[PDB]
Amino acid sequence: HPETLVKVKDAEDQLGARVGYIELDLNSGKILESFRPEERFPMMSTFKVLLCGAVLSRVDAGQEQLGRRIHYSQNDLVEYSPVTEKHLTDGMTVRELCSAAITMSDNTAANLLLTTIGGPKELTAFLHNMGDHVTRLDRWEPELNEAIPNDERDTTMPAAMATTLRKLLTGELLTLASRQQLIDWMEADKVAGPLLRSALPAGWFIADKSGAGERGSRGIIAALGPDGKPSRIVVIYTTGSQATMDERNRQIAEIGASLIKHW
Ligand SMILES: *[B]([O])([O])[C]([C]C1=[C][C]=[C]C(C([O])=O)=[C]1)[N]C(=O)[C]C1=[C][C]=[C][C]=[C]1
């Protein structure tokens, strides 16, 4: 709704930064509303969903096991590794690393998973293969959150991220069992409470993933809908603000309230 676009512009004014926005119809693929759709923004932690999608496609091909366990060391630990740091001892299975990467944004768990699939170059190839010729992952955690102005490394476009999430989630790409598993992980998101979840009415469904990085970067990707079923895709990225975390979360949650209102 254009009123939502007003809020996106109000946000750009508040944060003193650009805001990329996109609403997608989950069923048809139709674009509902947009803003800075083809500009590049840093994915930050939102790439974790893509990562686990590639991991799931390997599992579907029998090239990987969810039950497979992985061991690592203190040597592998990166800042912000809430679960991983807890099992230095017993290691973790593929499944748990994805859970950890998505529901808690665990940095080390992402790094371990990237290694398993072939690193950033392979992720990029995976994406490019499925029709996304824009989204690129160049670095590992946590340098990928640098967000230096104009750098194309580790970025996406709101338009590209939206359709790719759509394909993962509803395309024939992943098995039914894997798509479901991916949705399940997103739905259990334990760290995005102040963002869109904060504007959701009771009974609605939401499967999401957020990100935060240097230079005021912040963003979220999500599939939501009323009555326990997702029906739309919303992507929101911002970069360049001098605003604090709270103000940044406030603006995003404000865009979501507008989205709901005009549903
Ligand atoms: B990710 O953005 O690449 C990665 C981990 C992270 C940190 C904070 C919030 C989220 C989120 O809300 O989805 C994801 N980013 C970093 O590791 C940067 C960082 C930022 C702030 C605290 C710790 C790390």
Query: If we measure between CA atoms, which residue out of 61, 166, 156, 189 comes closest to residue 117?
Result: 61
The span from the CA of 224 to the CA of 192, in Å, is 14
Structure solved using which method?
X-ray
The answer to whether the beta carbons of residues 226 and 203 sit under 8 Å apart is yes
Instruction: Assess whether the C-beta atom of 216 lies below 6 angstroms from ligand 1.
Output: no
Q: Which CATH number belongs to the domain containing residue 18 in this structure?
A: 3.40.710.10
Known active-site residue 143: yes
Number of structural domains (the chain) is 1
In DSSP terms, 62 is beta-bridged to none
Query: If we measure between CA atoms, which residue out of 89, 96, 52 comes closest to residue 71?
Result: 89
CA gyration radius, the chain: 17
Instruction: Assess whether the C-beta atom of 142 lies below 6 angstroms from ligand 1.
Output: yes
Instruction: Assess whether the C-beta atom of 109 lies below 6 angstroms from ligand 1.
Output: no
Residues 6+ apart with CB under 8 A from 216: 15, 17, 238, 239, 240, 241, 242, 243, 248
3-state helix, strand, coil in the chain (%, to 5): 45, 15, 40
Known active-site residue 57: no
The answer to whether the beta carbons of residues 44 and 145 sit under 8 Å apart is yes
Instruction: Assess whether the C-beta atom of 53 lies below 6 angstroms from ligand 1.
Output: no
Q: Which domain holds residue 138?
A: 1-263
What resolution in angstroms, rounded to 1 decimal? 2.1
**Residue of 34, 45, 81, 258 marked catalytic:** 45
Both tokens assigned to 56 = 């799931």
Both tokens assigned to 137 = 């992952």
Kindly give the distance from the C-alpha atom of residue 31 to the centroid of ligand 1, in angstroms, as a whole number.
29
**Feature table: binding site:** 209-211
**Residue of 3, 38, 85, 143 marked catalytic:** 143
